[PDB]
Design a protein around this ligand. Structure first.
Ligand SMILES: [Mg+2]
Lengths: 312, 92, 158, 72, 53, 101
RNA sequence: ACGGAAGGGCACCACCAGGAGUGGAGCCUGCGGCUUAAUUUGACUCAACACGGGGAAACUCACCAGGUCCAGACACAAUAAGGAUUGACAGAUUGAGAGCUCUUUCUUGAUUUUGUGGGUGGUGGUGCAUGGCCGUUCUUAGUUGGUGGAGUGAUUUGUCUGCUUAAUUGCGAUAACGAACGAGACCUUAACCUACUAAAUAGUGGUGCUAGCAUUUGCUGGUUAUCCACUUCUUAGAGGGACUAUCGGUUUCAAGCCGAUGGAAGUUUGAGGCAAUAACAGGUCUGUGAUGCCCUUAGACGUUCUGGGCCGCACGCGCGCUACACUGACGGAGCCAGCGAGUCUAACCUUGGCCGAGAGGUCUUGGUAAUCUUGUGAAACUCCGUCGUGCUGGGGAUAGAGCAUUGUAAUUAUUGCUCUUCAACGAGGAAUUCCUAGUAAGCGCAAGUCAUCAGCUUGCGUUGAUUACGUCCCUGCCCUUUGUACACACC
């Protein structure tokens, strides 16, 4: 199966710094960008248009770094450089609760299962965990450099015994936290440059981390070991795991590369053409996420476009 | 061909509002199921249109495929309705 | 519904055969190569494989809506439950359906049989094919029919 | 099959070509009112605008396909 | 004219007919195929009838 | 919870087995009693035309085979997770029907 | 290429040794001939003749005797809103409730009518103009580049003395080296798995309830999920297993071959599918809205409807079915499979209850199917009895009377059932077909065609052999050598 051209989505005035989807509505797509706003999209499944935005969310005073959606497809969360987090709904905009207390920018926010609490990795070398009322119940330290990306793991069992989160900063080392005890459990060392993205597999066992040197090296936090390392030979910006089938995608500087990780080869080396842009550096994807069905992959490029790749 | 006039209108109306006719190549079909006139009436009227243009026909698997052309829409305009009307799916 | 699976699985197989013969007859000049039918609930779709997608996709979205409506009217589908896409080809020098249609239209334009065949077979080898073989049969230049073939590489029939 | 012998008697006859008579629409004209002759039909679908032909003690109308028969 | 198609066609070879070549001879109506013997052999692969043994 | 049944009919084993594996893969990641894939005996549809147009030549006979593979899985689940299991498993060559009761 | 030339091999479409037969009889089914209004037609050695999926009552249908319709699009010209034209009650007429056509006078009205061109259709012709498909040469192992060598050249070598193989399969030898297609490999199917993956749409054991005997704790059952457990049997995913393994014997000591053991399996494990280069004036224009050229195109070679014909019988031929009986016929009893098919806007596979000798009729039910038909309780087979060497009670041809089913329609009997009629045929001349192990042969069953009809075909299972393990004698095929006045190639 080959990912091909489907359409482009023009709804921003900046780099699409985040893409997120929910299983409640397959036609929804939340997109945070550099223009201090969030654009929710509506998909129709057609030619190059692919559909229209539904709601535009405003209220952040700086670059909205990371956006995420809950399971129901209604509530949304945004991490922006204005030292605050905002909780929205896709119905009428309508920021429910702000989350202030960080002394600097916050990179990544993440919602736990059953909308229970939220974690947030910021640029003040802290991982703040917040309630939905706006109360930061816990603050976690221990990172020497400021964190670049945090994520929760998807528990395969429906809340078996506990939930855990993972952290990745510019300190070439990956932390693994259990916020039930607010304790550190695993230091993951082996990176040679600053880590800028990490992603956990939907199976809840595999962790892929990658940085400026462009290596994508794997961990299994169930066994707390390291499997291997494979490189895209250029800087990589974001990673994404397919929810249904065994693929791993990487948003590189030269373009996008999707990996079939069971026999571990490259697939097609996605290189779209942008009608010129020859003299300077070509635009590249900065944030990407697989859809709920897994047959469509959205990628946020720098030139104001969310591009969709779909298997045939 | 006789082809009475009140049945010519509904054949031409369907060619206006849709522009696509398949019409089941089987004569004396006894009440063709989209336009409730005879299927012999549908086939021969659109054949009468085709011989002067205005529509293109493709035939496969005992089924015709009539499609309205750009030269047929302006003649079907003054024959049936008023201007500023989109016959085919050109309107979005 | 309420059809036995033997008669059901036969039906969509011959539904492909009716659609494939219709698309070869209709989009003959667009380099049509094949289709696949996506059997799914919630507005099942059909994907077309033709070389010239900018001709299959007409002006302001034409030429595929009429095709979708013609399939809708013929096969008795619910409105909005059938849609049509068009991705072009994967390596059109490697498809015989594309190459045989290219052979036919080159012959229809008045090209010589030897000149049209050698140009086609050299393009197939330039497309990375392991072996290619083109055979033309009929009354070529005289009243008595002959058959002259053009091969490059090698071909297995075992 | 070589040719046709046509043992049937030589009948190249056609139908009556809707026989070209003169003007026939006259109810009755007096010096200038109008009275009804060749009376209308009793069909509810015929709002008194169709003539009933009389041939031989019969009343037949052509608005129906076959039978508008009110004998008198 | 009431005698143009007055004869019934409910069974036999005159009722059924191939849906591709419009012929009554050599019809395959197994599994509701209703196709000619020769026309089936042309597009059995398109239908999905392959030849294994 | 409600007791349902997922029945899969296919002509391609490779396009059926991993989907039935995928159907059951979304079925033990959280725990519930399976009553898993029962494979019915395969159905072979045979058509035997002769070989030819009009009957000249040796009387050669053909056999065209269509292979049907069938499976059914009987699961029980609450209503909100019955929905998105039959939407994510959409793939060529196989039909999926769900029996409500 | 051929030889009534030689050498080496191979083949139950060849023989050997046999088996079952066919050719002899009745029948039914194609072909010819005859006949006919028509008995439509293609195909004539293998490679025409139960073939055209061709088991035709109408349809199919192309043939014959008749009756309709244009579904002749469009362009031009002419008639023509003082009417271009269509339809029709009743009667005549007609096989006919065809307004066919006529008598009469109503309706419709600008789409039609006529003329000029064209259009369209044709199961009309040409398969010796063609495409595609198939058959055959051809159940065999053959075929071709590159570079180099030989020859003035067509050509040749490679592609071969020998041995081996099912194989131009290999060992090898070598003016050749290195390759490609064919073969083989491959794919499907049938065999083995107490190993995995688990199955109330497959089973098994126990547990509950309950029946019959014995009674002593047992046997045979039933119980739609009462419950529990498992996958041996059944299913289907991924796999494993054979590669001639081991040993012995033979050869140039190799490719291999033979014998024995072990193994589910030792012939390429059995059977298929696929399948070279070149070719045929092979078949198909009657599969196609595949098609050139010629013909026809309105009183039509179009299309439709009513009847008939394809089936007609002094005779000849091919494929078959039933028999000539005791290894059997008939009547009860036992009861044993596999491949498959089956109906949503339509009557498909039909269980069960009732009526009827049977055919069958009626009321319901299950099944869109590992669920129900269905354990398809099939037939040959096996016991017990009658028959008693007799064209007999073998055989059921031909024919008469009646009862039912499908169909608009059953006469030229559709077919099924009941009673009666009780022919030839006493093991088949010359010739001739097929076959080597779960094979021939015997036997029935499902599917195709179907509305009704199977003595036909495609598959399936039941019972299950005798004879060979060879040869080139007959008929053919592959290679080499050889002769040739043959090249349309020994017809
Ligand atoms: Mg500059």
């Amino acid at each position: 199966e080959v990912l091909v051209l489907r359409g482009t989505l023009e709804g921003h005035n900046g780099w699409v710094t985040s893409l997120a989807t929910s299983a409640g509505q397959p036609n929804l797509l939340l997109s945070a960008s550099r223009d201090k706003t969030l654009i929710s999209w509506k998909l129709t499944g057609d030619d190059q248009k692919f559909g229209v935005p539904v709601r535009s969310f405003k209220g952040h005073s700086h670059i909205v770094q990371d956006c995420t959606l809950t399971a129901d497809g209604a509530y949304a969360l945004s991490a922006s450089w204005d030292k605050t987090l905002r909780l929205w709904d896709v119905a009428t905009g309508e920021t429910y609760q702000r989350f202030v207390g960080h002394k600097s920018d916050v990179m990544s926010v993440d919602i736990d299962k059953k909308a229970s609490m939220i974690i947030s990795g910021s640029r003040d070398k802290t991982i703040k965990v917040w309630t939905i009322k706006g109360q930061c119940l816990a603050t976690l330290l221990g990172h020497n450099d400021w964190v670049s990306q945090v994520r929760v793991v998807p528990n395969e069992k429906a809340d078996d015994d506990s939930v855990t989160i993972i952290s990745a900063g510019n300190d070439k080392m990956v932390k693994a936290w259990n916020l039930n005890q607010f304790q550190i459990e695993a230091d993951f060392i082996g990176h040679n440059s600053n880590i800028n993205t990490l992603t956990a597999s939907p199976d809840g066992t595999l962790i892929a981390s990658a940085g400026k040197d462009g290596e994508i090296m794997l961990w299994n936090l169930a066994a707390k070991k390291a499997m291997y390392t494979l490189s895209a030979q250029d800087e990589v910006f974001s990673l994404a795991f397919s929810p249904n089938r065994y693929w791993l995608a990487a948003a590189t500087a030269t373009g996008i590369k999707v990996f079939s990780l069971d026999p571990q080869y490259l697939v097609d080396d996605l290189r779209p053409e942008f009608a010129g842009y020859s003299k300077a550096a070509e635009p590249h994807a900065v944030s990407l996420a697989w859809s709920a069905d897994g047959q469509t992959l959205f990628a946020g490029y720098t030139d104001n476009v969310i591009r969709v790749w779909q298997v045939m | 061909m006789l082809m009475p006039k009140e049945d010519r209108n509904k054949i031409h109306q369907y060619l206006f509002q849709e522009g696509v006719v398949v019409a089941k190549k089987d004569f004396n079909q006894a009440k063709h199921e989209e336009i409730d006139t005879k299927n012999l009436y549908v086939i021969k009227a659109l054949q009468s249109l085709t011989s002067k243009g205005y529509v293109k026909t493709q035939f496969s698997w005992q089924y015709y495929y009539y499609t309205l052309t750009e030269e047929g829409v302006e003649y079907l305009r003054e024959y049936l309705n008023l201007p500023e009307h989109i016959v085919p799916g050109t309107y979005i | 519904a309420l059809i036995s699976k033997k008669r059901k699985l036969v039906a969509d197989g011959v539904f492909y055969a009716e659609l494939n013969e219709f698309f070869t007859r209709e989009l003959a000049e667009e380099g049509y190569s094949g289709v696949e039918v996506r059997v799914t609930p919630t507005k099942t779709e059909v994907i077309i494989r033709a070389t010239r997608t900018q001709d299959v996709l007409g002006e302001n979205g034409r030429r595929i809506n009429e095709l979708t409506l013609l399939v809708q009217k013929r096969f008795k589908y619910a409105p909005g439950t059938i849609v049509l896409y068009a991705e072009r080809v994967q390596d059109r020098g490697l498809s015989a359906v594309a190459q045989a249609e290219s052979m036919k239209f080159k012959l229809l334009n008045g090209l010589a049989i030897r000149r049209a065949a050698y140009g086609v077979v050299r393009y197939v080898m330039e497309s990375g094919a392991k072996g290619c073989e083109v055979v033309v049969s009929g009354k070529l230049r005289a009243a008595r029919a002959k058959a002259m073939k053009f091969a490059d590489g090698f071909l297995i029939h075992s | 099959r070589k040719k046709k012998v046509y043992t049937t008697p030589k009948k190249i006859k056609h139908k009556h070509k809707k026989v070209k008579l003169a003007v026939l629409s006259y109810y009755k004209v007096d010096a200038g009112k109008v009275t009804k002759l060749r009376r209308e039909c009793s069909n509810p679908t015929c709002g008194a605008g169709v003539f009933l032909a009389n041939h031989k003690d019969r009343l037949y109308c052509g608005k129906c396909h076959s039978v508008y028969k009110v004998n008198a | 004219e009431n005698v143009w198609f007055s004869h019934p066609r409910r069974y036999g070879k005159g009722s059924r007919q191939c849906r591709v070549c419009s012929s009554h001879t050599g019809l395959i109506r197994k599994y509701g195929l209703n196709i000619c013997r020769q026309c089936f052999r042309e597009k059995a692969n398109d239908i999905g009838f392959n030849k294994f043994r | 919870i409600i007791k349902i049944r997922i029945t899969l009919t296919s002509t391609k084993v490779k396009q059926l087995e991993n989907v039935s594996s995928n159907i059951v893969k979304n079925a033990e990641q959280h725990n519930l009693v399976k009553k898993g894939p029962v494979r019915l005996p395969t159905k072979v549809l045979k058509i035997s035309t002769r070989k030819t147009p009009n009957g000249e030549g040796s009387k050669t006979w053909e056999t065209y085979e269509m292979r049907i593979h069938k499976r059914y899985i009987d699961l029980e689940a609450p209503v909100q997770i019955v929905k998105r299991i039959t939407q994510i498993t959409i793939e060529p060559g196989v039909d999926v029907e769900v029996v409500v009761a």
